[PDB]
Design a protein around this ligand. Sequence first.
Ligand code: PRO
Ligand SMILES: [Cl-]
Lengths: 10, 349
Amino acid sequence: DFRFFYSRYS
Amino acid sequence: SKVTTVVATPGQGPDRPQEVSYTDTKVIGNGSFGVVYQAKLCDSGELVAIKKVLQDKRFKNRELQIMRKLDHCNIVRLRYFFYSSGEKKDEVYLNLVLDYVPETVYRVARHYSRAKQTLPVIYVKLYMYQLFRSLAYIHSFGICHRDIKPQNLLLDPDTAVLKLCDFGSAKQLVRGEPNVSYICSRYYRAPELIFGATDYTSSIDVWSAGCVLAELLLGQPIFPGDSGVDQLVEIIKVLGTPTREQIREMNPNYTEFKFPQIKAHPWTKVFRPRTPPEAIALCSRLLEYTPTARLTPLEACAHSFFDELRDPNVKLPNGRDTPALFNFTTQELSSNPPLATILIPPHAR
Ligand code: PRO
Ligand SMILES: [Cl-]
């Protein structure tokens, strides 16, 4: 589970 | 594009309100009291994250109080704060405007784990070292974070700069004044918190840091479980059954319970064979039952696992300079002021 909606690794 | 202005107070410096303009707002996550926003400050173009917390009429907000006092290269910076209405009718919300950092240790760790690859050891060293610096700094004020986990370790992946964030659970611990036991997130809780202790110390953060180190070495959390009893079984499978003396140091109300009887798993068998031995040795001095037997943050920074960081020629694998590693202050060094002879190497003096 993630802090942010978006990531360069998503 | 829409520009919003608000009267806000700088996070650091003069207690003097200013007009602050920002634009390009967008939702980037969710919080307990409303979604978290990214925005761009009009005056500098810098990106910020704005989060909302509930203002209590009875006492000053502890997170704001703590974040106005902190100034450290491995802690997220409070740029501004201001109050507003919010998601719930009639409530007043404190808005914290923080410097925006685009990634986390958790994202980088899951990226490697999904690829069935191990995070390169140089990054494990850089990230853990910066985490221990941030802990040395806050612990030197008596402040325990109480919620260390990979999602609270912001990361700029290109520069390898790490910043600790989310001080919503943080507290100045005072010996003899009880603390709630129900802080710290699943997988990262020290065993004295699993046992419900109200008399714990800042060493709960070092246990959690040990859990983060182990997770970066293993590619998955070392003590998973959805209940405390499942977490404890995973702890006992590694550390072995705690002795009565160890239980008294964690929570003496628990000394006489019947715990699973398991011999410790050798630390050299916990991790994969090629795991660097100094990383295993450091982990073994962080994940200790007896809270006073855990290394302090400054002691962890001086551990031989971090020796490569102190080499004059160390570079990031992408060819960049390492980030700032040796700008210790008196405050940060104060738990052991004569320490440093290790911490500030010759080329940094
Ligand atoms: O441990 C704690 O966070 C706080 C301090 C008084 C109310 N309980
Ligand atoms: Cl995350």
